[model samples]
Target: MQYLLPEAKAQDSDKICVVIDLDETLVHSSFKPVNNADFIIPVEIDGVVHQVYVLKRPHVDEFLQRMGELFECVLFTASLAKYADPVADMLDKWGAFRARLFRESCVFHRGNYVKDLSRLGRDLRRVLIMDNSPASYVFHPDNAVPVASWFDNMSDTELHDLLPFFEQLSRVDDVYSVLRQ
Candidate 1:
């Protein structure tokens, strides 16, 4: 399936826009149960009993808190809206995310959901797409920061580690020149 978002107007901010991935990039969500699962929310896909296991990374709230303050943060996930939207709301109860794009917003390329950053209609030079999967941003890899895919790691600091990198990226005149595919 495919979808398109309404044109997002440019916000009044000096902060660079950061497009973050949902699943592994922020929290590890799965239909498969973990050892000591955090939250077991039931969901229906097509028509069946499906439970989502969402484990918020250590300090995920802190990471989002800081990112929200530092940039025009947007949640861009390959996960379907049925899965990602609700989770995004739970995570950003503060409404840190200025925009939300789901699997439908992605390019269904060769069995992989390729997130199309250009659909955002933002200034490419000031945009950053933080995703664990490289293929998610293959079309615009220069704007992406490849993060380590997280499943059930209780000790993942990759999100925290990105702060300094984003800080440095903020100083750059153009992000494309700095980040490579």
Candidate 2:
């Protein structure tokens, strides 16, 4: 996948910030018996396991790169710090993530998402969360835009489906611009 920089910054200080979820948001994994062990393994095809890796989800790389150039990207996940570490390692390997995330970024530990976002500072107008779970966004639908899950394999159609939303977000200057009056 090709990566591109964002058109403009999201913050007034010439910075753009994005919070992306891991797991189904970026990669696909499943539990398959291996060596007589029931391991939580990644999905595969034709007897070939793809392993846990980020989705080259259509414009995802481009969008991420753009966001990288404009804002500090934070990987947020509902998964525990232990399981989530592998994902952070993967991003580092791909050169997609530059900044390390805070403990707050992994919000599922804090109970429901409304409380999670509140802890992250709920001026939702300044933040955008890209996740696969609609339930996570239901409380603050305006700021959380649900992306389809990558599941066991990558889907070009699903990736392409995000373009319009990105375009709209790219045009927005603040959360209030899209969320509040």
Candidate 3:
């Protein structure tokens, strides 16, 4: 049996869980970011200095805040735990995220890091994963919503449009119905 959204009776009291990808979906991080003078973190990857620049997707603040009110948020990424944890902690200082999953949570499939939500230990029906790569959702396409990649696109508004889309999805008894629509 697969996980499913809560039935209508439970929908009101139950929380809908939304899993989001880390890089490209919400923000873009790189060794070089638009040549803009901004805060950059220096890390030693292989005894060499790597300057990382992080840029938040447009409307990230409002998007996540509204999400917190509507769904139980989880961060799912195929990135390093050490790199993602600190960044996720900074964004979720007020505790919007109930859980966070990193590269370790992903299943290595066909040379790609595939995310299997079954390991999340939550009801699959109530869960939806938003990611930029279709490969990331190969295991559970029914629960995945394809999102545009945001690699340092300062004007990207994809994240802004997600709240309303998800706000409506939360009211449904079956998330896959809308996800597949």
The superposed Cα distance between candidate 1 and the true structure at residue 73, in angstroms, equals 1.1
lDDT of 1 by residue, 1-181 (tens): 2223344446525567788998777888777777676667777888996988888887788888888877888888877787787788788966779888887778798889987776776678878888888888778878888888888778778888888988888788788778743
Q: State the C-alpha lDDT per candidate.
A: 0.79, 0.53, 0.76
Which stretches in model 1 have alpha-carbon errors above 4 Å? 1-13
For residues 26-53, write the lDDT of model 3, one tens digit per residue.
7788876556623366666878877778
Count of clashes, each model: 0, 6, 5
Higher-ranked by TM-score: 1 or 2: 1
- Sort by lDDT, top down from the best: 1, 3, 2
Q: Candidate 2, overall lDDT?
A: 0.53
Predicted structure 2: clash tally: 6
lDDT of 2 by residue, 48-164 (tens): 755443333445555565555544466766665544665566444444454444344434533654214444432456567677876665556666666777654433465456656
Q: Between which residue pairs do clashes occur in model 1?
A: none
Error of 1 at 134 (Å): 0.5
The candidate maximizing lDDT is 1
Pairs with backbone N, CA or C atoms under 3 Å apart (clashes), candidate 3: 3-124, 3-125, 4-125, 4-126, 5-125
